[PDB]
Design a protein around this ligand. Structure first.
Ligand SMILES: NS(=O)(=O)c1ccc(NS(=O)(=O)CCNC(=O)Nc2ccccc2)cc1
Ligand SMILES: NS(=O)(=O)c1ccc(NS(=O)(=O)CCNC(=O)Nc2ccccc2)cc1
Ligand SMILES: NS(=O)(=O)c1ccc(NS(=O)(=O)CCNC(=O)Nc2ccccc2)cc1
Ligand SMILES: [Zn+2]
Length: 257
């Protein structure tokens, strides 16, 4: 099956998921000189006060913090979006080295990691239906640079020892995802896809301009995770990012000047 290795990585995915060569694939490079300010874009509305985190899972590709999405508890609205999108999970993509790891790039710059807060459009009833729709998902992407620690990330960092290997999960209640946001909600937006198989073209991407900073010790602990299951050959979970894909017939819009 698919992965990030030399024999099963992004250059192989099209063989089982031909949409990998489609018209609206993600991530992309964000050319800040070609993205156009759109005054019709509204401020984003991030309403996470009632968020209910439940569990953290190592799925062999990343780790997902999962939320209760059976009511409007943690929702994203506004910006480019029509309607209400519920947070179902967040996860990250990161590098083996501080100079790489993000999926989106900004003027070809790679960040150390990238956080994806994944939301689905409530008009489609459930996440599985939503991924089949061109406006089914909204993923809020946030870049991570290495610098000062991010206090709101530490609870995530600290549980990773309990989910080192593929298939391990741990209770992860009462986590507040607002602690992962930067100060500014200025963003770029474009239509795209899931960045992992099945690569479905169902995502409105909203990528924040302002990165968050995490410490070297925090990102080092991401890199101690394992892609493999317990008892299999140890392979460090690093470089779990897809590189930028062709923008094709798409425009990236900026919420700011
Ligand atoms: N196209 S893909 O999903 O990346 C894919 C699927 C399977 C393999 N290899 S193998 O495990 O069957 C032996 C590689 C890539
Ligand atoms: N019940 S919950 O606690 O709120 C919950 C449940 C699962 C997750 N995991 S996930 O976010 O990675 C989404 C996993 N993908 C699907 O579930 N796909 C799907 C869904 C319906 C039909 C066909 C396919 C997170 C929270
Ligand atoms: N990197 S990204 O573009 O933000 C991105 C990439 C993928 C997803 N999909 S996901 O949430 O479901 C996590 C993957 N897990 C499954 O698909 N599980 C599953 C599968 C079949 C049936 C039931 C469950 C979301 C965001
Ligand atoms: Zn992702």
């Amino acid at each position: 099956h698919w992965g990030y290795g030399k024999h099963n990585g992004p250059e192989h995915w099209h063989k089982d998921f031909p949409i990998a060569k489609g018209e609206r694939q993600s991530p992309v490079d964000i050319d800040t000189h070609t993205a156009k300010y759109d005054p019709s874009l509204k401020p984003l509305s991030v309403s996470y006060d009632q968020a209910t985190s439940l569990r953290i899972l190592n799925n062999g590709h990343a780790f997902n913090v999962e939320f209760d999405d059976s009511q409007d508890k943690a929702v994203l609205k506004g910006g480019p979006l029509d309607g209400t999108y519920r947070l179902i999970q967040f996860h990250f993509h990161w590098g083996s080295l501080d100079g790489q790891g993000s999926e989106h790039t900004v003027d070809k710059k790679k960040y150390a990691a990238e956080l994806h807060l994944v939301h689905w459009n409530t008009k489609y009833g459930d996440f599985g239906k939503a991924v089949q729709q061109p406006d089914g998902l909204a993923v809020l992407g946030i870049f991570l640079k290495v610098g000062s620690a991010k206090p709101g990330l530490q609870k995530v960092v600290d549980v990773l020892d309990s989910i080192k290997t593929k298939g391990k999960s741990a209770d992860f209640t009462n986590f507040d995802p607002r602690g992962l946001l930067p100060e500014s909600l200025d963003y770029w937006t474009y239509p795209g896809s899931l960045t992992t198989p099945p690569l479905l073209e169902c995502v409105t991407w909203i990528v924040l301009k302002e990165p968050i900073s995490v410490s070297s010790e925090q990102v080092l602990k991401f890199r101690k995770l394992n892609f493999n299951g317990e008892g299999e050959p140890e392979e460090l979970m690093v470089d779990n990012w897809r590189p930028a894909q062709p923008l094709k017939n798409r425009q990236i819009k900026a919420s700011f000047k």
